[PDB]
Symmetry: C5
Subunit: 310 residues, 5 copies
C-alpha cells in the first residue's frame, strides 16, 4: 500500500513582497516525518537508538538499500533556495525526521491590483510530491505549519493563514500529492496617505485658495503645472506596479485629477476671454460657478470612483 | 545504431522578460526518456523493478559501466541555472527517466522593436545534443512540452507555442540534434496608454486651449516647456529599450511631437513679430490658421506614422 | 547527562545596515568548544596530539562513529552565508574546537523608526541548538564574543554590546538552547543636518527675507514652490525607510512644513485680496502680523513636535 | 619534449558590454585537444573506443595515474564563471577532448573614450597556461575559435576578430603559453543621435527663433535655463562612463555649449543695458550681430572640435 | 620548531572601489610555498618527481597522513570569493606550491573623506594564519607580491605599494602571523572639474553678468533658484559618499555657496526696498558694493576653505 509522508512548513520571516515582480521571499523550515520499515535498525545495548545524518550521506544510504525517497518540489519556487540546515534523524523504527531550513523567493500569481492600495492578496507555497499517490500520500504534520511572530514585514499585515492537501498531475498520468500553505495579507495605508493622498490634496486645496485673487491667467498657469505634477505622480505610482493590462483604482483617481485640471484650464481660458472682449463684469458674475465648481468637481469625482469600485 | 532520446520541456513560470537586455527568465522542467539496454538490471523476486538515483550517483554508475550519456546543452542559456530537482528513475529494462527542474535566464535574440509598443516577439529555448545524430537522435516526448497556466506575466500575452526538432553543428563535423520550444507573445497596451498616450495627449490638448487667450508670447513659453517635457518623455522611453541602431515607431512619434512643437514656437514668434511691428490686426486674422493648424498638424502627423509603419 | 557546548561569536565588520529592508550584514567568526569523550584518540609517541580536519571529513567521521553533533542554526539569518573557514581541531581528549568565518545578512526585527533620525536600535544574532537542552546545553565561551575595532560603519555608532543564553521551542516540545549576541547602535546626525535640516532651514529663511519686498503675489508664488520642494523632500526621506504603517518624527516635521506653507499661501491671498479691493492701506498695517507670523509659526511648530515626541 | 595543447574559444553571445565598469560579458565554449600517450587504453572487442567522463572523475583519474594536466586560467576573467558543460571524451589513443561552456564577465582594459561616441574599442580573452612552454605548448585548434551569428548586442558592431598565441611570465620564471581571442567593435550612433544630438539641436534652434521677438530680457531668461539643461545633459552623459581623468569628445561638445550660452547671456545683458540707458536705437542696429552670431558661434564651435579631435 | 610558510599576493585587477560602501574589489593570485618533510615521496626511475593535485584531493591526502596545513584567512574579506584556480604541485622533497586565483571584495576601513575630492586613501589585504607562530611562521615570497600593469581603474591612481609581515591574536592567546599587502591611491580630479567645479562656476558667473541689468527683483529670483540648484548639487555629492558623521571639504564648499547665495537674496531685497521707498538714487550708488561684493565674496570664501583645510 502507499506510505504516508507528513509535511510541515513554517514561514519564520517575510524578507519582502515584490509587487512589481509578483513574487515574495521568506525564511522558513520544512519538516517531514516518513516511516520506512526497511530503514529500521538494531543497536547493541548502550549505543544510540537515534542515528543522525547529513542529507548527503542519508540519500547515499537510501541508494545502497535501494529505497525510493518521497522526492518533492516547491512548485511555485523562484531562483535559488539558500539552505541553512538539511538534517535527518533516524529511529530504530525507521521513522525518518527531516528538517530543511531555507531562504527563497516564491511566485505570487494570485496578485490582483484592481483595488490598489485598498487591495488584499493571497500568497502560497506549493510542496508537490514528484511520485504519485499510489506510492506516497502527503499528510499534514500537526503542530508545526503556519507563519511566525517576527515576520519583519511593515506594509503588509497577514489577515489569515491556512494549510490544505490536494493533487497535481505535473510529471505523471496518475494524481500526485500537493501540500499547500496559504496566507492572505492586506496593506497598511499610512505610506499612501502620507506620500500620495496628503500631497495631492495639498496641491488641490492651496491651488484653490488662489482663486480668491480673481486672476484667471494666474489660475491657468497654476492648473498647467498642477497637471504636470499629477503626470509626475502618475509615473511614481507606475513604478511600484507591473505593466498591467487593466485599470487600477489608483489609475482611475489619477486620470480623474487630469480631467478636472484640464477643465480648470479650459474654463478659466473662457473667463479670461470674456474679460479680454470687454465683458469683465460678466466674467466676475460667472466666477462664482468657477470658484465653487473646483471643490464640488473633486468631491463628485471622489464619490464616482468609490461607487464605480465599491 | 543510434539511440532515441526523448526530450520534453515545460515552462511553468515567466519570471520576467527584460527587453533592455534582450533576454527572458523562466522556471521550467526538462524531461528525458532514454533507453540504454546496457543499464538493464536483474532483481530477485519482491525487490524493486525501479531503482531511483540522485544525478551524481547515476553519472558515477555510467562512468563505471563505461556508458556515454546523451550530454546536452541549453544553447541560448544565460548565466546560472539554479536547479531544484535533478532525479533519475531506472527500470529493469534500462529505461532512464530524467527530470530537471530549473530557473534560468535565456537569450532573446529574435527581438524586433520597429513597431514597439505594437510589436509581437519570438522567444525560444534550444536544447542541443553535444553528441552527433549517429549516436543519439532527439525525439519529442509526447504529453509534456509547452507553457503553463500560471506563468505570472502581466504585460506579455502568449499568442502561440510550438515544439520542433532540427540540427546544429556546434561541436562536431556531423549534424547533431536540437530540440526547440518556441512561443510568440505580444504586449498589453494599457501601460503605454495610461503612462504615455494620455499624458502626451493631455499636454497637447490643454496647451491648445490656451490659444483662445490670443497671447502669442504665452503660447511661445508654453510650447517651449512642452518641447522639454517631450525631451524628458523621450528619455523615459529610451530607458525601457536597448541602444538600438534603428528607429522605433515610438521614436518616430516623439520626433514628430518635437517638429510640431518647434513650428508652434516658430509660427507664434512670427505672429508676435507682426503685433510688434504695428500689424496687430493682421496677426489677429492669420491667428485662425494658427489656432486650427495645431490640431490638424498632430492628426496629420498621427496618420503619417500609421501609414509609414502600417 | 547533557554535554556542554561553548558558543563564541565575534562580529569583525558591519558591512551595512539596510533600514529600508530592516536587515544588517556582518563578517564574523563563530567559535565552538565541545568535549565528546567518544572522540578521544590514542597516538603513538611523536605523532600529533591534535588532529586537524576539514568540516566535511569531520562530519563523516561522526557518522561512522554514530555520534550526534550539536546541530545549530542562525535563527535570524537571511539568504546565503558565504563561508571563509569551517575548520575542526580535535585533541587526544575529545575536545573539538570549531571555527566558522562567515559573511551574512541577518534580520533586524527590532526596528522602531518613531523617533527617526534621533532613534537608537537593537540588532542581534540568534544561534539556536536544533537539539533540546537534555542532550546539549549551550554555554558562553569566555574570551571571545562581541564586536571588533574596525567595523567599518560610518552612520551608526554602537552604544552597547551583550551576550546571553536563553531557550526556544522551534523544532521540539522540550526547551532548546539559544545563544544571543546583541548590540545597540544610534545615528550620526551629520548627514541629516547637512542634507535635510540646513536645506529646509535655508528655503524657509531666504523665503522669509522676500517678505520685506511687500509683494503679496510674489510671496504666494514662492510659498507655492516651497510647498512642492517640501513634497519632493518628503519623497526623498520616504526612500530611506520601509512603507511603515506609523508616523515618524520626520513625517511630523514634513507635514508641519506643509501646513505652515499652506497657511502662508492662504494668508497672503487674503492680504492681496484687500489690496485688490482698494484697502491697500489696511493690507499694509496687517502685514506686520504676516511678517512676524512666519518665524513664530515655524518655531512654535518645532517646539510642538519636540514636546509631542519628547 | 613538450606536449601540444590545442586551444579553441568561441563566443556565442555578448550578454553585454558595461563601459561604466570597463568589462564585457559573454556566453562561450572552450575546446581543448591534448594527446597524452599515458592515457591510452585497451578495450575488449565490442566495448567503447571512446570513454566519456565528467570533469571531476577525469581529474581524479589523472591524480591516480600521476599525470599533470595543462592547468589553464582566463587571465582577464572577472568574478564567477557559471559553467554549463565541463565534459571529457578520451580515445584509445590518449586524445583527450575537453569542452567547457560558460558565462563570464571579462576585463576590458583597452577602453579609450577620447572620441566617444565615435570610438572603436578592443575586447579580448586571455587563456594562459599555468605551466611553462617546456611542459605544455599552446596551439590554435583550427575550425573553432571566433564570434557567432547571434551575439545579441544592439549598440556595438564587431568590425574584426583575431586569434593569436603569445607568452606570459605570471607564475613562472620561464615563458608560459597564452592563447588570445581578440575582437574590435564600434558604436551604432542612432541612440546618441536620437537622445542627445536632436534634443540639444532642438533646444538651440527653437531658442534662436525667439531672437526675432527683439526682447533681450526674454533671451537672457532663455539662455539661463538652456545653460541648466546642458548642465543636466552633462550629468546624463557622465552616467554612461567611468570617472575618467581625460577629456572626451562629448565633454568638449558639452563645455562648448556652456561657453556659447554663457556669452549669449553676457551679450544680451549688454544690449539690454544700452536699451536701459536710452540707447535703444543702437541696441537695435547691433542686434543683427546678436542674431547672426548665435548660429555661426555653434557652427564655428562644431568645426573647432572636429578639427581639434580629427 | 615552526615551519616557514611563504606568502605571495599579486592584485591583477582593481574591478572597482566603492566609496559609498567603503570596500574595494580585486582579481588576484595568492602563492604559497611550504615545505613539509612528511609530504616527501619516493619515485621509481623515470616516473614524476612532481605530483600535481586539485585542492580537494590534496587536503584529503593531508587528513590521511594526519598533517596540519597552515590554515589561513583573508581577514578583511567581504562576501564570496569566486575562485578560478586552487592548485597544488608537490615535489619529492615535500615542497608544496599552492596557487589560489580569486575575485573578491575587501573592506576599506582606512577611508578618510575630510579632504574629498583631494583625498589620498590606503587600501590593504590581510592574510592571517589561523595557527600561532610556534607552529607556522609567515615569510614574504620574494618575486611575486604587488599590483599589476592592467588594473583597469580610471579614477584612482596608485601612489605607492608595500608588503610587510606582523602579528594578530584573533583566534589564539599566542601571536599568529599576518601578511599584509598595502597600497595608496589618489583621485583623478577631471570628473569633479567637469561635472561639479565648471557647472557651479558657470551658474555663479553667468548669474553675476545679470547684475549689469540693474533689476534687483530679477537678481532675487535668480539667487533663489541658484540656491535650489546648489541644494540639488549637494544631494548628488551626498550620493557618492557614506552618511559620514564628519564635514567634507566638499560639504564646506557647498555650505559656503548656500551662505553667499542667501546673502545675495538678503542684500538685493534691501536695495529693492530702498527703490520701493522712493530712494531709487541711493540704491543705485550702493549697487556698486552689490556688484563687486558677489565676486569677492566667492573668492574670499574659496581662500577661507583652502586655509581652513590646507
Ligand atoms: C503648485 C502648487 C502650489 C500653488 C500655490 C500658488 C503659488 C504658485 C506656486 O508655483 C506654481 O508651480 C506650478 C507647478 O509647476 C506652476 O505651473 C505655476 O505656474 C507656479 O505658479
Ligand atoms: C504644461 C502643460 C499645461 C498647459 C496649461 C497652461 C498653463 C501653464 C502651465 O505651465 C507651463 O509649463 C510649461 C512646461 O514646463 C512651461 O514652459 C510654461 O512656461 C508654463 O506656463
Ligand atoms: C525657492 C527658495 C528661494 C527663495 C528666494 C526668492 C527668489 C525666488 C526663487 O525662485 C522661486 O522658486 C520657487 C520654488 O520652486 C518657486 O515657487 C518660485 O516661483 C520662484 O520664484
Ligand atoms: C527651453 C527651450 C525652449 C525655448 C522656446 C521658447 C519658449 C520658452 C520655453 O521655456 C523656457 O525654458 C527654459 C529652460 O528651463 C527657461 O530658462 C526659460 O525661462 C523658459 O522660458
Ligand atoms: C540659473 C543660472 C542661469 C542664469 C542666467 C540668467 C537668466 C535666467 C535663467 O533662469 C533662471 O533659473 C533659476 C534656477 O531655477 C530660476 O530661479 C530663475 O527664476 C530663472 O530666471
Ligand atoms: O534530493 C534532495 O536533495 C532531497 C530530497 C529529500 C527527499 C525525502 C527526504 Br525524507 C529528504 C530529502
Ligand atoms: O552532466 C550533467 O550534469 C547532466 C547531464 C545528463 C545527461 C543525460 C541524462 Br539522461 C541526465 C543528465
Ligand atoms: O552541518 C553543518 O554544516 C555544521 C554543523 C556543525 C555542528 C557541530 C559542530 Br562542533 C560543527 C559543525
Ligand atoms: O582544474 C580544473 O577545474 C580544470 C582544468 C582542466 C585542465 C586540463 C583539461 Br584537458 C581539462 C580541465
Ligand atoms: O581549507 C582550504 O580550503 C584551504 C586551505 C589551504 C591551506 C594550506 C594550503 Br598549502 C593550501 C590550502
Amino acid at each position: 500500500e502507499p506510505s504516508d509522508v507528513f509535511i510541515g512548513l513554517k514561514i519564520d520571516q517575510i524578507t519582502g513582497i515584490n509587487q512589481k515582480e509578483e513574487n515574495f521571499s521568506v525564511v522558513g523550515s520544512l519538516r517531514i516525518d516518513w516511516r520506512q520499515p526497511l530503514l529500521a535498525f538494531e543497536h547493541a545495548p548502550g549505543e544510540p537508538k537515534h542515528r543522525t545524518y547529513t542529507l548527503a550521506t542519508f540519500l547515499k544510504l537510501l541508494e545502497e538499500k535501494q529505497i525510493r525517497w518521497p522526492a518533492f518540489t516547491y512548485h511555485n519556487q523562484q531562483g535559488r533556495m539558500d539552505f541553512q540546515n538539511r538534517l535527518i534523524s533516524l529511529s530504530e523504527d525507521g521513522t525518518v525526521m527531516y528538517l530543511e531550513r531555507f531562504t527563497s523567493t516564491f511566485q505570487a500569481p494570485a496578485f490582483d491590483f484592481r483595488l490598489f492600495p485598498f487591495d488584499n492578496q493571497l500568497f502560497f507555497i506549493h510542496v508537490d510530491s514528484i511520485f504519485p499517490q499510489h506510492l506516497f500520500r502527503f499528510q499534514e504534520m500537526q503542530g508545526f505549519s503556519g507563519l511566525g511572530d517576527q515576520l519583519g514585514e511593515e506594509e503588509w499585515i497577514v489577515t489569515e493563514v491556512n494549510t490544505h492537501l490536494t493533487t497535481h498531475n505535473e510529471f505523471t498520468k496518475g494524481d500526485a500529492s500537493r501540500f499547500v500553505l496559504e496566507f492572505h495579507a492586506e496593506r497598511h495605508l499610512n505610506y499612501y496617505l502620507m506620500r500620495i493622498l496628503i500631497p495631492v490634496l495639498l496641491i488641490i486645496t492651496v491651488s484653490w485658495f488662489t482663486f480668491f485673487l480673481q486672476d484667471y491667467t494666474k489660475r491657468i498657469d497654476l492648473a498647467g503645472g498642477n497637471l504636470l505634477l499629477f503626470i509626475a505622480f502618475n509615473f511614481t505610482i507606475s513604478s511600484d506596479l507591473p505593466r498591467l493590462g487593466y485599470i487600477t483604482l489608483m489609475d482611475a483617481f489619477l486620470v480623474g485629477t487630469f480631467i478636472i485640471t484640464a477643465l480648470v484650464v479650459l474654463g478659466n481660458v473662457w473667463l479670461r476671454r470674456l474679460e479680454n472682449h470687454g465683458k469683465q463684469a460678466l466674467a466676475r458674475k460667472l466666477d462664482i460657478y468657477a470658484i465653487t465648481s473646483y471643490p464640488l468637481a473633486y468631491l463628485l469625482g471622489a464619490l464616482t470612483l468609490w461607487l464605480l469600485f465599491f
